[PDB]
DNA sequence: GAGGCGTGGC
DNA sequence: GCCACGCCTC
């Protein structure tokens, strides 16, 4: 139910919040700064910043299970795993 | 690899 | 709002 209020928007989202961070698209707000010493990258939403941060701090949560690499995203550990079947 | 983004549990 | 999921596009 909740739309986009700019004319050449219709996007529709479910919760409150989608919507809150698609207007910073219009807007072009980033309040998620990365706090890199000469990184410089802002984002609208939490995630992309938290995911960003990995590249520089070598965090890889995601292990693969039969060998020895592992991610810091889930969705390329998935991908990894098609080398396996 | 990595940003952009729709969606949803808490 | 946080944060994860999974997908898209380059
Ligand atoms: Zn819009
Ligand atoms: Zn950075
Ligand atoms: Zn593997």
Redesign the pocket.
């Known amino acids: 139910t909740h739309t986009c209020d700019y004319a050449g928007c219709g996007?529709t989202?479910?919760?409150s919040?989608?919507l809150?961070?698609?207007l910073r698209?219009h807007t072009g707000e980033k309040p998620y700064h990365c706090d890199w010493d000469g990184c410089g990258?802002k984002?609208?939403?939490?995630?992309?910043l938290?995911?960003?941060y990995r590249?520089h701090t070598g965090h890889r949560p995601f292990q693969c299970q039969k060998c020895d690499r592992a991610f810091?995203?889930?969705?390329?550990l998935?991908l990894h795993m098609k080398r396996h079947f």
């Open positions: 996007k989202y479910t919760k919040s989608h809150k961070a698609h698209t990258w984002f609208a939403r939490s995630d992309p938290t995911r960003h590249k810091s995203r889930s969705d390329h998935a």
